[model samples]
Target chain A: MSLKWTRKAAADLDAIYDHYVVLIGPEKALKAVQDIVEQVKPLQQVANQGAGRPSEVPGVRTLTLERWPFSAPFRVKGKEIQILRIDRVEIT
Target chain B: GSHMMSTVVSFRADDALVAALDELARATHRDRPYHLRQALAQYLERQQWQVAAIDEGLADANAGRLLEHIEIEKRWGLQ
Candidate 1:
């Protein structure tokens, strides 16, 4: 299956990038987003790849980033994993 | 001075977070205040939506507008 980005997810990335770019630099900000993007690219090669979390909400599976406080919630349909939300796990 | 929107609320962050914030502002070509406003707005939008949804569900339950336990199971296709 392929990956898809949701508005919320894209917005979250923009927000996160904006956040990082302000504190670090363009170099790190770009690198940080690329790190997360790389994870999304390999979803179909394996099952339980994301070790998806369970949800009471329908049509969504939660996949987390390896080294960030972010998660990409999505739903698997046909050949695409439709992204639902980009959630911040640690806000404090 | 008015103690409303004009109030200055100062807070702190760790070095790492501060660095990230500064980087984001520089990369976006925006100022600190703009990003702060963006963060605040995003946070409020997310939290308020959750609050409203919870209130809606509570109101529904209070009005006896709920389904049976078995109905939920059937909807899950396991009943």
Candidate 2:
């Protein structure tokens, strides 16, 4: 199966990068957002490993990053795993 | 205990920026240097992780381990 980042998810990533750019700067912000994308790459292989419980959307599984306060919700359809959105969660 | 040792570094900042930093420090009940270090440390850690992840992605590409892009567009009806 392959992985797909939905348009909304792409926009979410841009919003994340833009938010960080105001606080940190463009260079560091790009790296931060890229790291988030990297964390989601594993879903291409292990889509079912994402947590189903507490998912905000039905038929969607949420993957929480261990290294950062971010959650990626995705759906598996046919032979593709499509990321629905990138969410920034509370650190605590 | 070894890591607890802190060193002082001198830098220049614009007067306006320093004033804004001071305001934030007071509002957060944190000192200026404390916030500076926090920002620097967090930025450095994120940079380190980003580099590592990019290297991993490069390896994946070199090994031809990647998803098909056309399939994605077709699935989303973006074509």
The clash count of every prediction, one per candidate, is 16, 0
Q: How well is each residue in B1-79 modelled by candidate 1, as lDDT tens digits?
A: 3475655657987899878999999999998888987898798787555444334433433353433323322432334
Against the true two-chain complex, what DockQ does each candidate achieve? 0.03, 0.04
lDDT of each: 0.60, 0.65
What are the chain A TM-scores for all the models, listed individually? 0.80, 0.85
User: For each candidate, what is chain B's TM-score?
Assistant: 0.73, 0.68
Largest DockQ belongs to which candidate? 2
Model 1: what TM-score? Answer: 0.49
Count: clashes, candidate 2: 0
Q: How well is each residue in A1-92 modelled by candidate 1, as lDDT tens digits?
A: 55555444555566777888989998888777667666655654547444577533554556767887776655565655555555666435
lDDT of 2 by residue, A24-92 (tens): 998888778767776776676763545544453345666777766777766666776766666666454
Give each model a TM-score: 0.49, 0.50
Docking class of 1: incorrect
Across B1-79, the per-residue lDDT of candidate 2 in tens digits comes to 2567777888998999899999999999999988998878897776455344334433443354444545433433434
Off by over 4 Å in 2: A47-54, B1-79
